[PDB]
């Protein structure tokens, strides 16, 4: 049974408490009595190196078999790579993709150096929800669709959310509360 949520943000130097919807989602989830949504500024925030983010997820964010991991952009990539070798209660991917997009800073992360272990992810995480938008200025839909197909995600496909940089995200709250089994 899930005990907490963790937000792994996108790359970049924005404070996790105010960038996009992270702080709003944390505050909304923590309205549930006793429920923690961990969201911390990441080490190596610009390059988002796998060798730094994945240990941080294990040691400092305590991501385990009772954790719902909410990963956005680089954090979605990290959550997928994390789940190749870690049991995770559930993963909500926001703006997920599969390759370095030809960008050197994506490449520098190290997430895109070897094949995706899709079957291992699915065995380690039976509950994978995905948000994506066809007007994402950074991601081609093909890459978001590849994630949805390879991981058999519950796909919430939008047309007008871009890279999900807005400040509120009620659809995500509903998803997370469903995963927590909060009754209506």
Residue numbers in the entry: 3 to 186
Quote from the publication.
To address this problem, we investigated a cross-seeding approach with a mixture integrating a heterogeneous set of protein crystal fragments to be used as generic seeds. The fragments are nanometre-sized templates chosen to promote crystal nucleation of protein samples unrelated to the proteins forming the seeds. To demonstrate applicability, the generic cross-seeding mixture was simply added to a sample of the human retinoblastoma binding protein 9 (RBBP9) before proceeding with crystallization.
An atypical crystal form of the human serine hydrolase retinoblastoma binding protein 9 was obtained by adding the mixture to the protein sample before performing standard crystallization assays. The structure was solved by X-ray crystallography at 1.4 Å resolution. Follow-up experiments showed that crystal fragments of α-amylase were critical components in this particular result. A different crystal morphology was only observed when the seeding mixture was added to the sample in two screening conditions: MORPHEUS-FUSION D5 {12.5% w/v PEG 1000, 12.5% w/v PEG 3350, 12.5% v/v MPD [(RS)-2-methyl-2,4-pentanediol], 0.1 M MOPS/HEPES-Na [4-(2-hydroxyethyl)piperazine-1-ethanesulfonic acid], sodium salt pH 7.5, 20 mM amino acids, 20 mM monosaccharides} and F8 {12.5% w/v PEG 1000, 12.5% w/v PEG 3350, 12.5% v/v MPD, 0.1 M MES [2-(N-morpholino)ethanesulfonic acid]/imidazole pH 6.5, 1 mM alkalis, 0.5% w/v cryo-polyols}. However, no unexplained electron density was found that would indicate a cross-seeding fragment caused specific interactions leading to switch the crystal form. However, we could not produce a model describing the possible mechanisms of cross-seeding that could have directly promoted the different crystal form of RBBP9 (space group P212121) with α-amylase fragments, for example by comparing their lattices. In fact, other speculations could be based on indirect effects of the seeds instead of cross-seeding. For example, α-amylase fragments could act as purifying agents, by mobilizing poorly folded RBBP9 molecules, which enabled the growth of a different crystal form.
